[PDB]
Amino acid sequence: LEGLISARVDSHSKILYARDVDQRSTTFEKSLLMGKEFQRRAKAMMLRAAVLRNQIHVKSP
Amino acid sequence: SSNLLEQFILLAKGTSGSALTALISQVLEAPGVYVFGELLELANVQELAEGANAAYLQLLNLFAYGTYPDYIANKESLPELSTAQQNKLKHLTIVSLASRMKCIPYSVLLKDLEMRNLRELEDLIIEAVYTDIIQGKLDQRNQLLEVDFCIGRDIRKKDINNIVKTLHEWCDGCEAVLLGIEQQVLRANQYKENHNRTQQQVEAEVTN
Amino acid sequence: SIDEIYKYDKKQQQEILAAKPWTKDHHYFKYCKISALALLKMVMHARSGGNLEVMGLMLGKVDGETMIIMDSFALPVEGTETRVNAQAAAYEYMAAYIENAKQVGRLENAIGWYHSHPGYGCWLSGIDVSTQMLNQQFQEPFVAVVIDPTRTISAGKVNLGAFRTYPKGYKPPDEGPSEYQTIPLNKIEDFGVHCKQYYALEVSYFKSSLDRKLLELLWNKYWVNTLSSSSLLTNADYTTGQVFDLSEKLEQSEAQLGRGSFMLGLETHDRKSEDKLAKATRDSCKTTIEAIHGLMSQVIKDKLFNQINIS
Amino acid sequence: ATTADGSSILDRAVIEHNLLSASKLYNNITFEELGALLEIPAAKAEKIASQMITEGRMNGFIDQIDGIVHFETREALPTWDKQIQSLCFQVNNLLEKISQTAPEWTAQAMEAQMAQ
Amino acid sequence: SVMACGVTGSVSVALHPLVILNISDHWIRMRSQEGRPVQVIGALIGKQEGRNIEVMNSFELLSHTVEEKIIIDKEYYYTKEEQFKQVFKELEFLGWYTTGGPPDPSDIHVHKQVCEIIESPLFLKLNPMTKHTDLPVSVFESVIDIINGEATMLFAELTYTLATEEAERIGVDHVARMTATGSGENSTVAEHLIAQHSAIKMLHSRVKLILEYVKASEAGEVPFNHEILREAYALCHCLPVLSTDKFKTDFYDQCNDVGLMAYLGTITKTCNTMNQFVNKFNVLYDRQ
Amino acid sequence: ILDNTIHGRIDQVNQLLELDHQKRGGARYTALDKWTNQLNSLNQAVVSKLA
């Protein structure tokens, strides 16, 4: 938790093993999650700029 | 060889009787002759029967349609071979399984040819590469054998339909892909023409 | 003449090289005739190098005060500004062409060398003017032609122009830019000084050559090598290496948007390199187009041969 | 000269030559079978094959777990482009044979595509 | 006969108006030096990308004349082939042209030696009178046909067009004008698609040349030979090349690598247009 | 190994030096992680200019 290594404690044999994920699993999923937030934030920005065209500002408070 | 095939077909049609029986053993013993389709369909070898003459007719059929395990099962009824006739039969066994399946596993050739390791099993295959007989590649990960070029055993009188069928899909198959590539060029060129016109007429009206 | 310059004449080359009229006045060459078939070979060899500089060699003859550019071939040298004296690599090609031409009754020798200057337009820097003076005294005559491959795409203008550097003892003290083009704000101060070392020539065009006729007989047997595509595995290190340089450009764009080049009193002139976000977009798309270009050569191979199977 | 086995220098060049040819023909052979084919012990067939890989004169690797040395014969992507170039090379050699045996059939087959 | 239009080819010929200046340059020079209107022999050059034929310029032929035939100097042409093969390999060579008029039977014997070099040559004849609509030029193709049992090589006229390439027209107009050219469209996408479009047209012709060869040996045209059947049986048996589990696990892995990089590059192009719209909307419409 | 001279990993529980010849890539996947982090912070800057 504190270090930057990646080890696995095997209590069945008292041997510090190692079980890491694939390099393509942590890369394709991380890029796909960022691509979904990129399209969601870009489409949400058009909704904020849409009300700023027909002279509609902040009127909630 | 190719020049020796036109000499054995001329001597068999000129003589017959006891001279034809001695010509069969000379063809299988002399190397270079890998085809046996033009000599089996002839009427000279069909007249050999009753005794040792019938053994030469059955041996010619096993060298064209049979394989290696088909010869060891009836070795007592067929005449023995030498150091050159036995090695030539192993070359025809490799090209026999390639006509049915594209890839042949190593476990199949280890049982038919009766080996113990892979190099000794492939030792009889690499000898046909320099003689322009068997051409292909060796696979180690999948433990298979992808035979690309091989001999057609006989004159190919039954599997000749696959030759025209494979060439028809290569000629007619190119027309379907050509229609997709030509359509992609027209779509890409039309997108560049529409983008150049919509980017110049919208910038000229800013000054007015 | 008019009809004699279109063909190869042996009497024309025997009355010029034997007397050498260029030893009297260095301003003898006025026009330059470049073949239309050889122009496509010069714009294609420089376009394959991209942002790098390449050099080649041209072959032809002479006919008075006008040079003739017949055939031209490429050279494996990496330009001339990077490697000093780039004419040493062309010595093996010249020794095999002159010996094969004198036996058939041809006096065609060297005519000039062409290169490429992508970025700072088509001109001669301080390095090209020093090496050309040492080659004109040994392998005469020579002519320097610059081709800009990265300028005919955006502007759409075919940049072409031949120049000739004056030797020692004939440079004019004051001469304006004869062929002025576009120069970025970096090396524009050297254009007004180095322009007096050379001069532009009125380029012409004609149809002749000979190299553009024997390439069809070779394609009848060399067509098995033209299909050797699959660019995804050739320059695989250049595609991955370009992503490392993109991260440095993206980090500079974050500081550009944070500080801003529009301050009070002095705007649109604060930072040195402006529009970092617009320039980083084309760099990111370069790694995408080059990556999908190598895949198109592989998918087209799996649709013509892999879709055949067997019964 | 006395070069370990035998009484000549050729006793060492033959062993080194057979290992290079086996890297492109033999798939994977054990250490006990490779020594019996060369009349050499198993302790000598491993030291000679290991010196050829370090110097960069022989492909393949040696596995010390089961004692089975494997040879590299190219696979994966480099084998895909080799079969395509070898297939297109057969059409180039076949085109030269058709025009040589019957040059009239070459011009007739070309006009059939333009008519369709 | 000598002219009957046998098989009309469906190929498109992109003829250029610059091919007539080279023909007239060789006819006036040959007449002024000999004092008689003879027949000149040249060569048609250009570029062939499969179905489309582009004829840019032309050049005279460097051959001799003995008795009544034309011997192509193959000794000098093959000498420079070994040195010109390590630089480029583009720009094909078409056929040849001549100056005369009506088709003569003497030109049939000369066109027979041309087919031994290229598998698809072309014929051209310049006529002083009118014939077509624009320039008085016409392109012919070598079409063999039997006439009362005798097979003769006839010709077939075709209808040529203009420039069929945007990347090529910008280079041709800058050659004849010798001045300047207008800024248009360079078509960068079309310059890269010619490597794959011409590859299919080149492969479609090689299969057609070998399809009728094996089919003739099975029907009744080519005699039954055991050597031809044994040499073409395993030729098509290798198809498809590498289509097992080893190539299936590698083709899908390479597609996913470049597929993920395309998503990270597509979102960068959208951010470029988004920055130009935000800066133009937060100033005029917005004031904070 | 720490001096960037000998590649692989040491396994004391098996007395075998591991050297995976067909291991996972590390030259191309290391660039996609940096491109994702740079594009994530860039989207937060272009969206903050429009309230």
UniProtKB/Swiss-Prot annotation, chain A:
The PCI domain is necessary and sufficient for the interactions with other CSN subunits of the complex. Mediates the interaction with CAPN8. It comes from the Eukaryota. This is COP9 signalosome complex subunit 1. It is found in: Cytoplasm; Nucleus. Essential component of the COP9 signalosome complex (CSN), a complex involved in various cellular and developmental processes. The CSN complex is an essential regulator of the ubiquitin (Ubl) conjugation pathway by mediating the deneddylation of the cullin subunits of SCF-type E3 ligase complexes, leading to decrease the Ubl ligase activity of SCF-type complexes such as SCF, CSA or DDB2. The complex is also involved in phosphorylation of p53/TP53, c-jun/JUN, IkappaBalpha/NFKBIA, ITPK1 and IRF8/ICSBP, possibly via its association with CK2 and PKD kinases. Belongs to the CSN1 family. Widely expressed. The gene is GPS1. Component of the CSN complex, composed of COPS1/GPS1, COPS2, COPS3, COPS4, COPS5, COPS6, COPS7 (COPS7A or COPS7B), COPS8 and COPS9 isoform 1. In the complex, it probably interacts directly with COPS2, COPS3, COPS4 and COPS5. Interacts directly with inositol kinase ITPK1. Interacts with CAPN8. Interacts with USP48. Interacts with ASB4; this interaction negatively regulates GPS1. The modification Phosphoserine is found at S60.
From Swiss-Prot, chain B:
It is found in: Cytoplasm; Nucleus. Residues 1-152 form the PCI domain. The keyword Transmembrane does not apply. One of its GO terms (biological process) is regulation of protein neddylation. Its main location: cytoplasm. Transmembrane segments: none annotated. It comes from the Eukaryota. One of its GO terms (cellular component) is COP9 signalosome. Keywords: Acetylation, Coiled coil, Cytoplasm, Host-virus interaction, Nucleus, Phosphoprotein, Signalosome. Component of the CSN complex, composed of COPS1/GPS1, COPS2, COPS3, COPS4, COPS5, COPS6, COPS7 (COPS7A or COPS7B), COPS8 and COPS9 isoform 1. In the complex, it probably interacts directly with COPS1, COPS2, COPS4, COPS5, COPS6 and COPS8. Interacts with EIF3S6. Component of the COP9 signalosome complex (CSN), a complex involved in various cellular and developmental processes. The CSN complex is an essential regulator of the ubiquitin (Ubl) conjugation pathway by mediating the deneddylation of the cullin subunits of SCF-type E3 ligase complexes, leading to decrease the Ubl ligase activity of SCF-type complexes such as SCF, CSA or DDB2. The complex is also involved in phosphorylation of p53/TP53, JUN, I-kappa-B-alpha/NFKBIA, ITPK1 and IRF8/ICSBP, possibly via its association with CK2 and PKD kinases. Belongs to the CSN7/EIF3M family. CSN7 subfamily. This is COP9 signalosome complex subunit 7b. It comes from Homo sapiens (Human).
From Swiss-Prot, chain E:
It is found in: Nucleus; Cytoplasm; Cytoplasm, Perinuclear region. It holds the Pfam family JAB. Residues 183-288 are annotated as: Interaction with Vpr. One of its GO terms (cellular component) is nucleoplasm. GO terms for biological process: protein deneddylation; protein neddylation; regulation of protein neddylation. Widely expressed. Its main location: nucleus. Keywords: Cytoplasm, Host-virus interaction, Nucleus, Signalosome. SMART domains: JAB_MPN. Residues 13-146 form the MPN domain. Gene3D superfamilies: Cytidine Deaminase, domain 2. Belongs to the peptidase M67A family. CSN6 subfamily. Component of the COP9 signalosome complex (CSN), a complex involved in various cellular and developmental processes. The CSN complex is an essential regulator of the ubiquitin (Ubl) conjugation pathway by mediating the deneddylation of the cullin subunits of SCF-type E3 ligase complexes, leading to decrease the Ubl ligase activity of SCF-type complexes such as SCF, CSA or DDB2. The complex is also involved in phosphorylation of p53/TP53, c-jun/JUN, IkappaBalpha/NFKBIA, ITPK1 and IRF8, possibly via its association with CK2 and PKD kinases. This is COP9 signalosome complex subunit 6. It comes from Homo sapiens (Human).
From Swiss-Prot, chain F:
The chain holds residues 393 to 443 of 443 of the full protein. The lineage of its organism: Eukaryota, Metazoa, Chordata, Craniata, Vertebrata. Component of the CSN complex, composed of COPS1/GPS1, COPS2, COPS3, COPS4, COPS5, COPS6, COPS7 (COPS7A or COPS7B), COPS8 and COPS9 isoform 1. In the complex, it probably interacts directly with COPS1, COPS4, COPS5, COPS6 and COPS7 (COPS7A or COPS7B). Specifically interacts with the ligand binding domain of the thyroid receptor (TR). Does not require the presence of thyroid hormone for its interaction. Interacts with CUL1 and CUL2. Interacts with IRF8/ICSBP1 and with nuclear receptors NR2F1 and NR0B1. Interacts with NIF3L1. Belongs to the CSN2 family. Essential component of the COP9 signalosome complex (CSN), a complex involved in various cellular and developmental processes. The CSN complex is an essential regulator of the ubiquitin (Ubl) conjugation pathway by mediating the deneddylation of the cullin subunits of SCF-type E3 ligase complexes, leading to decrease the Ubl ligase activity of SCF-type complexes such as SCF, CSA or DDB2. The complex is also involved in phosphorylation of p53/TP53, c-jun/JUN, IkappaBalpha/NFKBIA, ITPK1 and IRF8/ICSBP, possibly via its association with CK2 and PKD kinases. Transmembrane segments: none annotated. Phosphorylated by CK2 and PKD kinases. It is found in: Cytoplasm; Nucleus.
